[PDB]
Each structure stands twice: as structure tokens, then as C-alpha cells.
Symmetry: D3
């Protein structure tokens, strides 16, 4: 009766993330890594490992999949952002990804990660140039009052999905200049499904300051109808 | 002051039921233009279902499964962690009564303020308020008659509740059923999940008659096996 | 067989051990021809049809449901039971030229009536749902129902064979349905909510 | 007077990158009208990808595979066979550079005319003119450092180019990757393709970790097993 | 064993296959004589390659039955006295057109053109009303030496080489009102890969040629490539 | 009910679409496709996929007889006779059908087509050559007809095909031919020889 010798963690803590912030390359269970060429037709055509979140960057985990990466690439090339703000850092993968990418395009960009819990961050202390971390909860806006003068243009991204609309109002009133993005990843389609009448009303409240950018907005399952930018 | 839309994940934005309102078509299509009528549903299909004017979050396939399960087991108690609007509570009571079964339905939740069942229709339904994370929410329960079906719809602290139920509640043949979450937990944490479930190998089995019979019950229908 | 028998698993044990959870097969374990039921009687109405009928019953609150085509009576017991628990005073009536196959015992036979044969006597209370489940001679019965039976609001419903009639003879189907343009309409809240009632839910208009 | 439209098969009509254009919707959509906004990409998806303003014919899925492979292998050499606009060359040289890998990137093509890489942005990238019909092209690969990834993206004389790579170029753990074409060679020449591949059974295995990970690499990632 | 071979250029087989002769596909993972007790547990899948499995009289047919059904209608309606095919290969299509016009009682000459007739598998026994010409498509002389043809006429492009110049020729020197010029296969690919130039080139013939809408959406292979003289 | 063939007519779009508006043309079929297939101006209730399976079958088997329960307007019969004739096979095509009237096939096109009137064989059916294909296209009394053919008609190698009604217990003297069973939706699991 192994269960009574056992206490059980709560598995909800792994929703959208997984058991480990550390990256580990996948592993073939039911087949050799080296399939021989005489039997090439008989090889299995499926992936061989879980496609839940297999993506990485320089040995850090990456929760933004390749289609998303192509959109952010295009968006960086066009906008040439002076600042990027990730909300929800997790393991640090996409922070390093944004900083490395702006560096290669020759863009002088400051990458800023905010989070509840930076203990999960996996970025070498040496590989941290042009990056700044901030512990703080989205749930209360002082996390954003406290930080200051960011250069523009500016991309603000919500991967945390918490207090999102109050943060969006904070951003329009106190941060975003014309042409700056505010991107809500993953979540906007679910909120519409679960709460159509409230979701539409909330989005609509921003009818005069934010518009959805139809050039990037339909270009990845993750950014799906979530890519917004400042007007007026 | 924007409400936090996460609150509504899996539930909806209003516990009260309202019938679908057609938006780009009249209710009455003229038969001379029968073929040109749009063949799609017409409404939002997120949780369209009802039972006597109360919302139903269990879709029709799931309901078919429970009908069969109730018919075979003939449970004398049904317990639901997660009550919400009460739809499924009243359904269970209503169905067991139609089948002639003497069944108490008990419902447990940390917030009962959303319940929509009129007290005139509360016969054989017992609501208790508690948090899954406190185990006393369960130790406070009075003796229950068997067979019994324990259903997790709240998904918090689920495995320690399984440990509790195996040890203090379930007689052989009784069901501990986890709706919806098993496939997600397995996707997000495949190893931990496997080890956890497997730790119940001696006391619970997966019932294959039902475990593949509905999208919501999928791989979550479990029963107390002989010691 | 009209009698109901639970599904039997030929390739799986019913009790799959938890230590091998991931290895369990994901398909249903048996045929999905007609595995539905209601209190030990067979139900040919799949769960989506059940839901539409539930909804229909709840808003209309029918005084009379008439089922042309009975088979074994499970749908008849379902209508009666469901109308009882909603509080609706409803008379289920079931008409088939052959009734031998009917499994309902004479005890829970309250508010149910069987007639055998074609055409007759309706001093029956409205609102009414008429369900054509005997897929022969349909458009004739539809004219017959509009001339003798149907009042405003009342439904006439064609299960199963509607999309098949547009498949085989499309020109005639449309003409034959378009002949009732002035009397019946297609209720678009239910007419797309089930494969079995798909585009077969009609109701008297005026 | 009409050009041979077959020339553009797989490539496109201009090797320079032109950003996509929205055919029938404004770029800004009013947020009060969000539910009504269209849902499909909004332009042609044939080959809309890019790296630093140059076209990339490797899509994001292929890009992710190569990243993984490059992180693990840490190749001292990558040889693209068939160049076109040079997008891949620029990309590989960049990805290795960020990754702290000291990597040479060689492009080989009969036609280097359509290469769009500026001369300023050309460190660790060398280009060689030459035909796959003839093997002295590859013979002057001046024993570049290892490990090495060799990729076929032109597809002429490909099986002879492989017998050569095995005997004179490749070492244990080096890659030989045929993009796009292997599933087409198997559809069309089931018998012959299956003989030719497999004639290399003692010298090359298919690496299953990367071999089913994108459409373009599908059943095409091979490596030297000595 | 790799050193002990010289490999053919497998591109040679693009859209053709490796063998002009028809070989009937055989089952691999199962016998052909399944038992009737096990009728339920027999699989739904075809059981073979599905690439270009079709045939006519022991000759490989590269036009799939869907495309074949629409030519049957087109021949029946128009009743052509001449059918030109560019791209012959095994001669399957040639013999099919010939056999179908004949069974339909039409006096139709089929004419097949190709740079390489070595691959043709039609017995001479069954060569009636078939005229082959060897010539390269990117070479207007190939067409200039074509004798007079009776009308109506259906001209079909299966070689897809120098195609637009050939339409220009066909429009200037062959096609009378009613006649068809039909590009099979290539058109969708040409619109994925060169949408600007393809649109420009087609609109060049706007005044002389039209997309026949009764046939052009009707098979995968003819999809958007069926055209005729206004 | 219409046994005669009529070519589909368009509705919303012209037949002649301009090539300067080529990219904008409608990509859908433009008309219903219940069964708009003909052979030589006669309707025909074979998909092109079914047409191709039978073709392969006639070419391999080379039947000296084809029987066909249900005829309708005669397409199949003419088609079969024409196909065996083009293939040089000496085949007789028998069409059996209770309502013979529908048959549009004209007298001058009947060589190797014999029609018999009747309901589902039972007499007025004489000795015929093999190999034989037998086709049930009229799905009443289909199973008694199987045993009867199995006991009085089918020799080894001969087929018996059920056409349309086979998704909706004979292992000793029959078998399912797996080369053609899956190859078309209309013959889904209906192709059974010996
Ligand atoms: N209320 C809250 N306030 C701040 N951070 C929160 C939060 N709720 C969740 N989070 C954080 O949100 C993160 C989501 S994962 C972040 C994904 C990452 N930006 C990438 O794309 O690679 C977690 O690290 C979690 O700790
Ligand atoms: N820790 C916790 N303890 C008790 N209930 C909780 C909880 N966390 C969430 N819940 C409750 O879980 C419920 C689950 S939704 C219930 C589903 C519905 N009654 C059905 O039968 O299908 C919500 O009402 C929520 O209030
Ligand atoms: N016989 C041959 N010898 C050398 N190069 C050839 C060749 N045939 C075709 N090519 C070249 O092959 C190239 C194919 S496109 C190259 C694809 C691109 N490098 C990518 O990353 O996907 C063309 O540039 C063409 O010039
Ligand atoms: N330029 C050219 N001139 C004449 N024939 C050519 C040609 N290019 C290719 N062909 C020949 O014509 C055929 C065209 S390629 C094969 C076409 C095939 N029927 C299809 O549509 O997919 C081959 O038989 C080839 O030998
Ligand atoms: N029970 C029965 N006895 C004899 N004929 C029948 C029959 N049931 C249906 N039929 C006839 O069989 C025909 C079936 S339709 C036959 C279609 C034919 N194979 C084709 O492709 O063209 C109809 O003409 C109908 O009149």
C-alpha cells in the first residue's frame, strides 16, 4: 500500500509548465536512436517523445514554440524595441531568447523579467547582460509602480495571466507610448470561451487606446488574437 | 476594477441558466428555403446543457455513462466535491429517484453561494461547506450508506483525498472518479502522476466499462477493489 | 434483440491495474451501434437527441407526446419519466403496426398508451410533440397531422431519415417540404443540435 | 514573353525578402469588434519566414531541430549544399555564434548570383561555385574541423555525393542530412531508393531523435556510425 | 556495398515512378483470402502505396478515376475529332482516349507528343488512331510541323515545359472556337510559387481563353487548369 | 426519381470565367454530387473509385459472365459489356431487375446483354460460363441468394459482390478478397470470391 507511506504534492502547480524548470533532452523509449538503413521503411513515423514542451534555448527551457518565435522575430525586426517586459519568467528561457535575439539584430534592448518566484530561474549568472529580474506579484500594481523609465519602443508581454486587465489599464495610462505592444499570450481565446459577455466588454473598454494587430495576431496558436498595440 | 476572468475557468460567467439566444438567424426558418438554412449550431456550445432549468456542466455523453453506472451499482450515496450551481446534484437525486433507488446526494464546496437549486427541490441533497485542503472537511462527514460514488469535480488536493477515501470511506465496488483532470495532469507531469496513481495499485482499479466512454470521465473512473 | 444487455469486454479485463495505467487501451472496448438505454430498456436515442428532447420538453411543457414507431418502449418510458420529474402532466402515446417487441412492464405503464396500426381518435390535449420514428410514408402523415392534429406551437419531428431524403431525391424533397411553407417551420434552436434530429424539427406556426 | 515558371519551384520568384501584405483587412482591428475579426493568417503561407531581413526556406520546426542538434553536437563545420539567397548560411553562422561554438559555414552552389547576404555580414561564411555533377567541387573542402554537418538542399547526384562523404569527409558522429526530398524519392522509386539507402547500412544510421521532428527533415537526418 | 554501385538520378522519376510497365500491387502484411469469421477484425486501410496505382488494359494510367470521369463527360459533350497530349510516357492515356472516343462512336484521332517515346508500352495490335511525335516542348518547331487537325479539339499539357509559349502558339495556329487547352497538375503549384507572374501570364490570354467552370473544379489533377476558346 | 441522364447546369457563376479575375474564382464543385456520373449519355451509379476497382477485377479475372441484380437505366450493363469488349474478353452480361422499364439501353447496343425480369434466378435462368462475377445491387433477400449461388452457380475463383449495404458467417466456401475490399467506399467490405 504505497499510498499510505506517501504524501502527494498538488499537480495543479505544473499546469502549463511541467515537473522541472531545468531542461533535459528527450529520450527514446521504444526504439534505438540509430535506426539502420536496411530497414528504413519500417521506422516509426511518430515523434517518439512527448511534444508537451520540448523546446529549448542554449540549454534553458523555452515555453514559446517555434511558430511563436517566428512572430516575435518579425516583430523585433520591424519594431526594433528598446525594451521588452516579460511577465512570468519561470526558468528564464524566453528572457535569454529575447536578449540574445535583439543583440544579433544589433538592437540595444533591455529585457525585463517580473515574477512571483525567481528561484526557478536557470540563467547562468554570467549570461545575464542586458537583463533585469524583479520579484513581485501581478496581483497588486505596486510591482509596476516601483520600476521605472524604460526606453521605447516597448513590448510588454503577459505570460502570467493574473490581474491582466488592471495591469493593461496601468500600462496604457502610465507606460505605453504609440506603437508599443501589449501582448497577452495563450489566454485570450479561453477567456472568450468561458466569459464572452465580460471578456468582450473588457476588451471593448480599451477600444480607444489599443487595437489588435492583424499582421501578427493570427500567426501562432499562442499569440492567437492576443497581440495589441497603443494608438492615439 | 476588472474582475479576474480566471475565476470562470471551467464554469462560465453566470451560475444561473439561460437558453441559447440565436444571433444571426431567426428561430423559425421558412420551409420553402429549407436547404439554405445554416447547418452549424448557432450558439456558443461551451456549456449549453441543462437539467430542469439548471445549468449542467456534465455533457450528454457523461450523463449516459452515469445513467448506466447508477443502473448497475444502484448507489445509496453519491458525493460530489465541487457543487457550483447544483445542477448535477439535482440530476443525481432526480435520476436515482426515477430508478426507484434510495440515494442521498451530498455535495461539498468551499463556496455554496452559487447554488441555484430551489429549497422546494432540495429533497435528499446535503450541502457541506469546506476546503479540500483541510482534511477535516471529510472527517466531519457522517456515516454514509453503500454502495457509494465519490466524484472529484474540484481537483484540489485530490490525491490525499483519495488516500482518505480508500482508508476511511470506500467499501469494495465503490467508485472514486476524477472528472476532466487526469489527461491534463498526465500531460503536464507524466512521471509524478504515474507514480502517484500506481501507488494505489493494491486498492483501486480503473474501470474499463466506463473509463473510455466519455471525454470528461476519460481515464478517471476508478473503483475500490477487494483488499 | 429488443431486450437490453450490458456491453461485454472481450479484449480487456474490466479492472485495469493502476500500475499499468498508461498502457490501457483508449478506445471504447465495444461496438457503438446502439449501446444506450434507460432503466434496463433499450434507447435508440443517442445522448444528443436526449438533450434536445429534454430542452424541448422543458420550454414547451407538452400535454401530449406521440411516438410513431415504438420498437421496445424505452424512449416511451423516457418521455413519461422525464415529463413526470419536470412536473408536466403529459400523456405519452405510442403507435406501431407491430408491438410484440415492447419490453415495458404493466406496472410502470402509467401515463403511457399503446395503439397498434395506422389510422383515429384524438381528444388529446395540447401542446403536442409528434415524432415520426417509423420512417415510411412520412410526408403523408405530415399532411395528416397538419389537417387533424397540430395546433400553434406544437412540434412535428422527423428522426433519422431527413438528410437521407435530401441525399437520394433532392429536387422532390425540397418541393415536398416547401409545400408546407405556410404551416410548418424549422426550429433552428434544435434542428442542428443532433445528428438524429438534424434538420427534422418542425412546428406549426399559424 | 514567358519565363520558365518551373525555375521557381520550391523557391519563389524573388530571392530577396518582401514582408507579407494584408490583402483584405486593415492592420488595426477595433477592439469593440474583436469577435468579428478574421481568424486565418491573412496572407500567403508558401514561404513567409525570415532571418534579419533575409528569406529562410527552413521553417520554424526545422529551425528548432537544428538548434537542438547544434547545441548537442557543437559542430565545427556546417556545409549547406545549395544556397539560393544565403538565409540559411547567415542563420547557421549566427546561431553557432550566440552559442559560443567556433563554426565554419560553407555554401556550395552552381549559381551564387542570388545570394542576398551583404559582404559586411559575412564572417565564418565561405561560398564555392560548382556543380554536383562533378565531385572535385567537394574534394577541395580542405579538411574542415569536426564534428561536421553536411546538408543537401540542391538534390542532384545526391547518392554519389554521399558515397564520397563517407570515404573522404565524414567521421564518427558527423551528420549527412537530405532535406525535403527523401519521402518523394520513396513515393516515386520505392524499389530503387530503398536499395540505394541501405547500401549505406554499415556506414550510416538514421537519427530518430531528429528524424521525425519536422516535415522538411522527415526521414532525412543521417549520421556516421563508424 | 555502397562503393559497389552507381546510383541513378532519382529525380528522373518525379511524378512518373520507376517502371513504365504496370505491375499489379500485391499485399505485404496479410493474405488476400481473409476468413469470413474474422470479417470484423480485418483492417480498413487500402493495403498498398496509393501513388499511381491506376491502369487501363494493363497499361499504367496517371490520370486518377476522378479526372477520368470528367474527361468522359467532356468527350461526350464535345465529341472531339482530335485529342493532343503533351507528355506520353507509357501511352496509357493515349490508349484510353482512343478507346473511349471509339466506344462512344466518335471519329477521334489521338496524337501524343514527347521528347522520349522509348517508354511507350502500347502493343501495335492496339495502335489504331494513335500518332506519336518525338519533339521537345521548348521548341516551337515541334508544333510547327503538326499537320491539319479536325475539330473540335482538346489539347492537353502533361509535360509542363515551355507551357505559356505553347498556348500562344496554340491560340495563334490551332484553336478554333470551342477547343480546349488544358493544363493538368502544374497550375496550383505555379500559383503557390510565383503568384505575381502566373496571374500576369494567364491574364495575358484573357480575351482569347476562358476557364470552363463545369469541369475546372472537378478533379484534383484538372483543378483550375481547364480552359477553352471563349 | 429520374433514370435518364442530365448534365449538371450551373447557377450562380458563368461557365466562362475570365482569366484576369482567375485567382478569385470559386473553388467548390459548383453542383450536388449524389451521383452525377454517366456512361455514354446513360446515368451510372458507380463512383469513379468503384469503376476503377471493377476494371482491375475484369482485367485480372477475365470473366465469361457478369450478373447484375438491379439495373435501373442500364449504365452498369452497357459499361461492363463495353469494358470486357475493349479488353477482348468474351463476356455475357446478364441484368436482372423487377422493373425493367427504366432501362434506356437501345436495341442496337445489346450485343452480349440479356435482360431477365423478376424479383429477388428462381427459374428462367440457364447455364452460363465461368469465371463469373455476381453483383447484388438490389439488397433484398441478399443472404438466401448467397447460399443459392454458393450451391448452384459459383465455382472456385468466382466473385460475389454486395454493393452499398455491407457496413449497415460463411468461412468454408467463400472468402473476402483484400485487394479490392478496401479500395473503394461503395464496395466497402462487399467483395468476396470463391
Ligand atoms: N500572480 C502572479 N504574479 C507574478 N507571477 C506569476 C503569478 N502567477 C503565476 N506567475 C508566474 O508566471 C510564470 C508563467 S511561465 C512564463 C513563461 C515564459 N515567459 C516563457 O515564455 O518562456 C510562472 O513562472 C509563475 O511563477
Ligand atoms: N480547494 C477547494 N475546496 C473545495 N472546493 C473547491 C476548491 N477549489 C475549487 N473548488 C470548487 O470546485 C468547484 C468545481 S466546478 C463543479 C462542477 C459541476 N458541479 C459538475 O458537477 O460538473 C467550484 O464550485 C469551486 O468553488
Ligand atoms: N546540380 C547542381 N549543382 C549545384 N547546385 C545546384 C544544382 N542543382 C540545383 N542547385 C542549387 O540548389 C539550390 C536549391 S534551393 C536551396 C535551399 C536553401 N539553401 C535552404 O536552406 O532551404 C539552388 O540555389 C540551385 O542553384
Ligand atoms: N520539355 C519536354 N518536351 C517534350 N517532352 C517532355 C519534356 N519534358 C518532359 N517530357 C516528357 O513528358 C512527360 C512529362 S513529365 C510527366 C508528366 C505526367 N503525365 C504528369 O502530369 O505528372 C514525360 O514522359 C517526359 O518524358
Ligand atoms: N427487390 C427487388 N427485386 C428486383 N429489383 C429490385 C428490387 N429492389 C430494387 N430493385 C431494382 O434494382 C435497381 C437498383 S439501382 C441499380 C444501379 C445499377 N447498378 C447502376 O449502377 O446503374 C432499381 O432499378 C430497382 O428497380
Amino acid at each position: 500500500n504505497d499510498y499510505s507511506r506517501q504524501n502527494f504534492q498538488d499537480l495543479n502547480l505544473f499546469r502549463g509548465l511541467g515537473e522541472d524548470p531545468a531542461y533535459h533532452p528527450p529520450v527514446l523509449t521504444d526504439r534505438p536512436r540509430d535506426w539502420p538503413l536496411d530497414r528504413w521503411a519500417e521506422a516509426p513515423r511518430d515523434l517518439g517523445y512527448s511534444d508537451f514542451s520540448p523546446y529549448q534555448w542554449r540549454g534553458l527551457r523555452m515555453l514559446k514554440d517555434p511558430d511563436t518565435q517566428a512572430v516575435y522575430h518579425d516583430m523585433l525586426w520591424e519594431l526594433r524595441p528598446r525594451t521588452i517586459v516579460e511577465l512570468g519568467v519561470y526558468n528564464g528561457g524566453s528572457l535569454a531568447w529575447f536578449r540574445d535575439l535583439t543583440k544579433i539584430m544589433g538592437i540595444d534592448c533591455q529585457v525585463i523579467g517580473i515574477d512571483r518566484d525567481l528561484s526557478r530561474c536557470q540563467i547562468p549568472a554570467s549570461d545575464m547582460e542586458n537583463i533585469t529580474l524583479h520579484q513581485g506579484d501581478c496581483s497588486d500594481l505596486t510591482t509596476f509602480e516601483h520600476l521605472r523609465e524604460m526606453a521605447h519602443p516597448l513590448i510588454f508581454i503577459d505570460n502570467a495571466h493574473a490581474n491582466t486587465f488592471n495591469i493593461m489599464k496601468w500600462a496604457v495610462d502610465h507606460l505605453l507610448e504609440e506603437g508599443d505592444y501589449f501582448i497577452i499570450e495563450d489566454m485570450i481565446p479561453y477567456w472568450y470561451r468561458y466569459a464572452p459577455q465580460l471578456f468582450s466588454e473588457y476588451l471593448g473598454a480599451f477600444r480607444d487606446v489599443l487595437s489588435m494587430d492583424m499582421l501578427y495576431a493570427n500567426a501562432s496558436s499562442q499569440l492567437d488574437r492576443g497581440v495589441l498595440r497603443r494608438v492615439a
